[PDB]
Structure 1
């Protein structure tokens, strides 16, 4: 029930994913102490609309009140931009952007560390991206989604962090949320063999502390039950013939848009 994208479909997500990454590349310079998250949200939206002539898939979604999600520190996800929420020195902040372009979505997010980073702030951010890269490196047809969550978890835990279990990455495309569910941890429940053309997200949410979270009153914002810091990075990718292509790659990523596996690349018949 997982949709297989069409070359044309794919070019579209590429455009979409590219637009999503640019929002993140653009926001960067405004992410600094004293900046309110409402303003960041503003910039983002203005950007999506006016310059990219696209639309935030988040804006008003099922009621969601802001253009992008800006989760600070113990906020795991769905953090709601608010003009009263100023960024502080040492904060860690996720900005989650989802853009719709020509009917296709581009979904990604990254962590920003404001001012002087904190030991743990820095480490979790690093570790979290790594868990994302790590999964990225394994994306390839024939692999089971389950081996990936497994890998993420293993890594994360070995690094002394936790993986939130309640929220996942997912198929995406014409629809914001599509199958499959992309768990960032092990699950006997998980059974998804990757096929080329599949487009989905990977967006491991990592707690410096315990994995338990708490959903807030507002119905959106998620936080760590123990109040430890939480970090997330996400990429939207397409499964290729031999690996994956990262649709939301940013200048600052240090992973290649295109990941291929030797064993899968085209080769002579006897090679």
Structure 2
């Protein structure tokens, strides 16, 4: 069941989308060596609840214990915030936020480099973001999702990195994870034609090393099998009549918010 949003729905998504983006903008100054991921999680949660008057979609979802997901270095996704986990110079960290406002979800994430960046970390983050931007520029009514995954993969692999297969983008709206599954690679299994009013995320996870991943015994944390660095970026978008609109665009994004094809 792929839900098509009404104009009224889209309006509420635009609000939730900006709320989510703002959490990312807000947190930046706190990301420095010596801060713990547990502290970053508290600041985010406080902000969401007390200032934004919204709510974290993650808290309690399937039993998830925290408000945001913070993944450092080799952690692929779902890293659990913790008071004992301190950031060090050179770490790369993803903060994945999902907020609910008036019943609609806004989901986005970005990488942050702590202190002095490493060559590998900088490059990996760059390539990952570019792969997301690439996909965004392709979105328009009529195209098959398959083409998008194929493009991301080709890009990434051409640059010597790999794409994680197991986790992917998803529809989103009143529900956190709705149809469809947005794969970040080429798969003959994929056959979805885009149409206006569809809302979903693109959130490619790219590994510096091999594509293989492993789940941790905590049941959430996912890490690379070869312990290479892994990066991810994410945006929520709505398919428009002639392209797409990025609902979670931030001040530091360098892609326009409305992408038009003609």
Q: TM-score, normalised by structure 1?
A: 0.96
CA distance in 1, matches of 2:219, 2:197: 34
Residues of 2 paired with 1:140 and 1:66: CA distance? 35
- Residue 108 of structure 1: CA displacement? 0.2
CA distance, structure 1, for counterparts of residue 214 and residue 116 of structure 2: 28
Which deviations, in whole Å up to 9, do the C-alpha atoms of 1:135-190 show, x marking residues without a partner?
A: 00111111110000000000000011000000000000000000000000011000
Alpha-carbon deviation of 1:239? 0.4
- 1:111 deviation in Å? 0.2
Report Cα offsets for 1:59-92 as digits up to 9, x if no partner: 1111101100000000000000001100110000
Whole-angstrom CA distance in 1 between matches of 2:159 and 2:225: 20
- What is the rounded CA distance, in whole Å, between the counterparts of 1:93 and 1:143 in structure 2? 33
Whole-Å Cα distance in 2 between the matches of residues 93 and 236 of structure 1?
20
Residues of 1 paired with 2:185 and 2:21: CA distance?
Answer: 25
Q: CA deviation at 1:35?
A: 0.6
Q: Secondary structure at the residue paired with 1:176?
A: coil
When the two chains are superposed, the root-mean-square deviation of aligned CA atoms in Å is 0.4
CA deviation digits over 1:201-240, x for unaligned, max 9? Answer: 0000000000000001111110000000000000000000
Q: Structure 2 CA distance, aligned partners of 1:238 and 1:118? A: 35
How many angstroms does 1:114 deviate by? Answer: 0.4
Q: Deviations over 1:12-40 (max 9, x none)?
A: 11000000000000011101111100000
TM-score by length of 2: 0.99
Q: What pairs up with 1:1-271 in 2 under 5 angstroms?
A: 1-262=1-262
Whole-angstrom CA distance in 1 between matches of 2:33 and 2:191:
44
Paired residues, number: 262
CA distance in 2 between counterparts of 1:170 and 1:230 reads: 20
- Tell me the distance in 1 between the aligned counterparts of 2:32 and 2:134: 29
Gaps of 5+ in 2: none
How many Å separate the matches in 1 of 2:236 and 2:58?
15
Structure 1 residue ranges, 4+ long, deviating more than 4 angstroms after superposition: none
SS of the counterpart of 1:147? helix
